[PDB]
Amino acid sequence: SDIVIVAGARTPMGGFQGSLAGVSAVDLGAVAIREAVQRAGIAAEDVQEVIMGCVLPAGLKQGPARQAALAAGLPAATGCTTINKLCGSGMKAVMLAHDLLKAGTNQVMVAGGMESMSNAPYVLEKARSGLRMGHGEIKDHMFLDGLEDARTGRLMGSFAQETADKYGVTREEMDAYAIESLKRAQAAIADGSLAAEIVPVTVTSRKGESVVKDDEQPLTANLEKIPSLRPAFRKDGTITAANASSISDGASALVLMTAEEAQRRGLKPLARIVGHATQSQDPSEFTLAPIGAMTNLFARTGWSKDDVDLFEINEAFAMVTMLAMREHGLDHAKVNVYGGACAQGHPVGSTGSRIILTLINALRQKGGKRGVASLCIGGGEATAVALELL
Amino acid sequence: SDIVIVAGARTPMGGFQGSLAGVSAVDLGAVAIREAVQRAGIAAEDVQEVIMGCVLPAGLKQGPARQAALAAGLPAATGCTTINKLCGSGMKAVMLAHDLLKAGTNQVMVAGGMESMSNAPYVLEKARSGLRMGHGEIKDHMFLDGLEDARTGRLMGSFAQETADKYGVTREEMDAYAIESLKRAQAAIADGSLAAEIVPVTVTSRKGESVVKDDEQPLTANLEKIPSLRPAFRKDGTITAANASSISDGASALVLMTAEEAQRRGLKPLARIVGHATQSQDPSEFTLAPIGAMTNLFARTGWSKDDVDLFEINEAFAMVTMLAMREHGLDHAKVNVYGGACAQGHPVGSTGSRIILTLINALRQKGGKRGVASLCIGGGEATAVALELL
Amino acid sequence: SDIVIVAGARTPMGGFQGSLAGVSAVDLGAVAIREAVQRAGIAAEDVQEVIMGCVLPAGLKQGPARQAALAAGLPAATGCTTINKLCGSGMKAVMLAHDLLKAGTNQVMVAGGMESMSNAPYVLEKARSGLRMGHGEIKDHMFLDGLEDARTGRLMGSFAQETADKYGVTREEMDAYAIESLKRAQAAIADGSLAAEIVPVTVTSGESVVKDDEQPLTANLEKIPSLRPAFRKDGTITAANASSISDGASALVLMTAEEAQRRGLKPLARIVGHATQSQDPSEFTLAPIGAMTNLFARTGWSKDDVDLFEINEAFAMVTMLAMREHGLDHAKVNVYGGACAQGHPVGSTGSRIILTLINALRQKGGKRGVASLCIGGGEATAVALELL
Amino acid sequence: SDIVIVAGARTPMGGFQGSLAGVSAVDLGAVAIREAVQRAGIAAEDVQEVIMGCVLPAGLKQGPARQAALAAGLPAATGCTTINKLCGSGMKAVMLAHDLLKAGTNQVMVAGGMESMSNAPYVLEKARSGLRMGHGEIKDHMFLDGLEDARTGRLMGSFAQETADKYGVTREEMDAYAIESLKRAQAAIADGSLAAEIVPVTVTSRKGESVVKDDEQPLTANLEKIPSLRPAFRKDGTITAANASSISDGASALVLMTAEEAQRRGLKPLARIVGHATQSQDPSEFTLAPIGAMTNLFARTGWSKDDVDLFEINEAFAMVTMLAMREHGLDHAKVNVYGGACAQGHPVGSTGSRIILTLINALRQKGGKRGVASLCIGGGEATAVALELL
Ligand SMILES: CC(C)(COP(=O)(O)OP(=O)(O)OC[C@H]1O[C@@H](n2cnc3c(N)ncnc32)[C@H](O)[C@@H]1OP(=O)(O)O)[C@@H](O)C(=O)NCCC(=O)NCCS
Ligand SMILES: CC(C)(COP(=O)(O)OP(=O)(O)OC[C@H]1O[C@@H](n2cnc3c(N)ncnc32)[C@H](O)[C@@H]1OP(=O)(O)O)[C@@H](O)C(=O)NCCC(=O)NCCS
Ligand SMILES: CC(C)(COP(=O)(O)OP(=O)(O)OC[C@H]1O[C@@H](n2cnc3c(N)ncnc32)[C@H](O)[C@@H]1OP(=O)(O)O)[C@@H](O)C(=O)NCCC(=O)NCCS
Ligand SMILES: CC(C)(COP(=O)(O)OP(=O)(O)OC[C@H]1O[C@@H](n2cnc3c(N)ncnc32)[C@H](O)[C@@H]1OP(=O)(O)O)[C@@H](O)C(=O)NCCC(=O)NCCS
Domains belonging to chain A, first-starting first, are: 274-389 (3.40.47.10)
The DSSP symbol for D231 reads: P
**Contact partners, residue D344, CB within 8 Å, separation at least 6:** D13, D185, D215, D217, D218, D246, D248
Task: Note the residue count of chain A.
Answer: 390
* Closest C-alpha residue for ligand 2 atom 42: B245
Give the Å distances, CA to CA, from D314 to D15, D96, D272, D348.
17, 20, 21, 11
Tell whether residue A247 is among the known ligand binding residues. yes
Residues 272-301 of B with CB under 8 A from A: 276, 278, 280-283
Describe the crossing of helices A348-365 and A89-102 by its angle, rounded to 10 degrees: 70
Q: Is A245 marked within a binding site? A: yes
From first CA to last CA, the distance across chain C in angstroms is 15
Q: Are A39 and A5 in contact (CB under 8 A)?
A: no
**Among chain D residues, CA nearest to B129:** D130
Contact, B157 vs B342, CB < 8 A? no
10 Å CB burial of residue B171 (0-12, 13-18, 19+) is middle
Residues 6+ apart with CB under 8 A from B38: none
**A172 exposure class (CB count in 10 Å sphere: 0-12, 13-18, 19+):** exposed
The Cα-based distances of D73 to B98, C84, D78 in angstroms read 73, 21, 10
Q: Give me the sign of the Cα torsion angle A167, A170, A171, A176.
A: negative
Are the CB atoms for B117 and B348 separated by under 8 Å? yes
The resolution in Å comes to 2.7
Task: Give the pairing type, strands D271-280 and D381-389.
Answer: antiparallel
> What stretches of A165-289 adopt beta strand conformation (E)?
201-203, 210-212, 248-258, 271-280
Count C/D contacts: CB-CB distance under 8 Å: 199
Which residues on A lie below 8 Å from C133 (Cβ)? 128
Q: How far is CA D320 from the centre of its chain?
A: 15
Q: What are the respective helix, strand and coil percentages of chain C, to the nearest 5?
A: 40, 25, 35
Expressed in angstroms and rounded, the spacing between residue D246 Cα and the centre of ligand 4 is 5
Q: What are phi and psi of B373, to 5 degrees?
A: -125, 135
**Spatial distance between the Cα atoms of C12 and C213, rounded to a whole number of angstroms:** 5
Q: What is the DSSP letter of C244?
A: P
Nearest CA to ligand 3 atom 9: C239
Q: Does D75 touch chain B (CB under 8 A)?
A: no
Q: CB contacts < 8 Å between A and C, how many?
A: 18
Q: Residue A296: which H helix or E strand, with range?
A: helix A289-301
Query: In 3D, which of C251, C238, C201 has the Cα closest to residue C69?
Result: C251
The CA dihedral of B262, B267, B272, B278, to the nearest 10 degrees, is: -60
Contact predicate A107/A97, CB 8 Å = no
Contact in structure between A344 and A251 (CB atoms under 8 Å): no
How was this entry determined? Answer: X-ray
State the number of CA atoms in the 13 A half-sphere of C145 facing the CB.
Answer: 29
Work out whether strand C108-116 and strand B248-258 pair parallel, antiparallel, or are unpaired: unpaired
CA pair distance B54, B26, nearest whole angstrom:
10
Question: Could you give the CA distance from residue C339 to residue C213 in angstroms, rounded to a whole number?
Answer: 11
Residues at CB less than 6 angstroms from ligand 3: C 87, 147, 156-157, 178, 182, 218-220, 223-224, 227, 230, 239-240, 242-245, 314, 340-341, 344, 374
Contact between residue D259 and residue D2 where contact means Cβ atoms under 8 Å apart = yes
Q: Which ligand is nearest to the CA of D244?
A: 4
Candidate list D54, D80, D328, D376, residue with the active-site label: D376
Output the DSSP codes for D271-328: EEEEEEEEEE--GGGGGGHHHHHHHHHHHHH---TTT-SEEEE--SBHHHHHHHHHHT
Q: Tell me the CA distances in angstroms from D149 to A71, C84, D153, D157, one per residue in order.
A: 54, 21, 5, 11
How far CA A40 is from CA of A6, A8, A355, A358, in Å, comes to: 6, 8, 19, 16
Beta bridge partners of C108: C255
CA distance B161 to B236: 10
Q: Spell out which residues line ligand 4, taking CB within 6 angstroms.
A: D 87, 147, 156-157, 178, 182, 217, 220-222, 225-226, 229, 232, 241-242, 244-247, 316, 342-343, 346, 376, 378
DSSP letter, residue A5: E
| Probe target for ligand 1 pocket from A222, A314, A383, with the most ligand atoms within 8 Å of CB | A222
Based on its alpha-carbon atoms, the radius of gyration of chain A, rounded to whole angstroms, reads: 20
Distance of alpha carbon D286 from alpha carbon C86, whole angstroms: 29
Binding residues of D: 132, 217, 225, 245, 247, 342
Could you tell me the distance, in angstroms and rounded to a whole number, from the CA of residue C242 to the centre of ligand 3? 7
Cα separation, D82 vs C211, in Å, equals 32
**C206 Cα: distance to centroid of ligand 1 (angstroms):** 23
Do residues B269 and B387 touch, judged by C-beta distance below 8 A? Answer: no
- Ligand 2 pocket by Cβ (under 6 Å): B 87, 147, 156-157, 178, 182, 217, 220-222, 225-226, 229, 232, 241-242, 244-247, 316, 342-343, 346, 348, 378
The CA distance from D314 to D91, in Å, is 11
Measuring CA to CA, which residue among C121, C183, C175 is closest to residue C146?
A: C121
Q: How far apart are CA C277 and CA C294, in angstroms?
A: 7
Q: What is the spatial distance between Cα C157 and Cα C145, in angstroms, rounded to a whole number? A: 15
CB A371 within 8 A of CB A308: yes
The three-state (H, E, C) secondary structure of chain B, written as one string: CCEEEEEEEECCCEECCCCCCCCCHHHHHHHHHHHHHHHCCCCHHHCCEEEEECCCCCCCCCCHHHHHHHHHCCCCCCEEEEEEECECHHHHHHHHHHHHHHHCCCCEEEEEEEEEHHHCCEEECCCCCCCCCCCEEEEEHHHHHHHECCCCCCEHHHHHHHHHHHCCCCHHHHHHHHHHHHHHHHHHHHHCCCCCCECCEEEEECCEEEEECCCCCCCCCCHHHHHHCCCCCCCCCCCCHHHECCEEEEEEEEEEEEHHHHHHCCCCCCEEEEEEEEEECCCCCCCCHHHHHHHHHHHHHCCCCCCCCEEEECCCEHHHHHHHHHHHCCCHHHECCCCCCCCCCECCCCHHHHHHHHHHHHHHHHCCCEEEEEEEECCCEEEEEEEEEC
Backbone angles phi, psi at A198, to 5 degrees: -95, 160
- Using CA atoms, how far apart are residues D384 and D274, in angstroms rounded to an integer? 11
- Three-point CA angle C81, C21, A138, nearest 5°: 85
Helix A289-301 crosses helix A318-328 at what angle (to 10 degrees)? 40
Contact between residue C320 and residue C173 where contact means Cβ atoms under 8 Å apart: yes
Going by C-alpha positions, the residue among A149, A288, C383 that lies closest to residue B67 is: A149
The C-alpha atoms of residue A358 and residue A336 are separated, in whole angstroms, by: 9
CA distance D17 to D248: 8
Q: Which of C178, C209, C186, C199 is nearest to C359 (CA)?
A: C199
**Cα(B324)–Cα(B327) distance, rounded to whole angstroms?**
6
Atom of ligand 4 at shortest distance to CA of D220?
29
| CA-based nearest residue to A350, from A37, A73, A74, A94 | A94
Calculate Rg over the CA atoms of chain C: 20
Residue closest via CA to ligand 3's atom 20 equals C240
Distance CA B161, CA B232 (A): 9
**DSSP conformation letters of C276-302:** EEE--GGGGGGHHHHHHHHHHHHH---
> Per-residue DSSP letters for A313-356?
E--SBHHHHHHHHHHHT--GGGB-TT--HHHH---HHHHHHHHH
Query: In three state form, how does the secondary structure of C141-156 look?
Result: HHHHHHHCCCCCCCCH
Q: Which atom of ligand 1 is nearest to the CA of A378?
A: 48
Q: Count of CB atoms within 10 A of residue D5's CB?
A: 28
Dihedral, CA of residue B9, residue B11, residue B12 and residue B13, to nearest 10: -110
What chain D residue is nearest to B133 in terms of C-alpha separation? D128
Q: How far is the CA of B275 from the CAs of B53, B98, B104, B304, D327, in angstroms?
A: 20, 9, 17, 13, 88
d(CA C388, CA A295): 93
Q: Which residues of D touch C104 (CB under 8 A)?
A: 102
Half-sphere exposure of B11 (CA within 13 A, CB side): 37
CB spacing of C100 vs D105 below 8 angstroms: no
* Strand stretches in chain A, DSSP E: 3-10, 14-15, 49-53, 82-84, 108-116, 122-124, 136-140, 201-203, 210-212, 248-258, 271-280, 310-313, 370-377, 381-389
Q: Which of residues 85-124 of B touch A (CB under 8 A)?
A: 85-86, 92, 96, 98-100, 102-105, 118-124
Choose which residue among D186, D225, D315 to substitute to test ligand 4 binding: the one with the highest number of ligand atoms within 8 A of its C-beta: D225
Q: Which of A24, A105, A149, A276 to substitute to test the interface with B, most B CBs within 10 Å?
A: A105
Candidate from C122, C134, C139 with C-beta closest to B140: C134
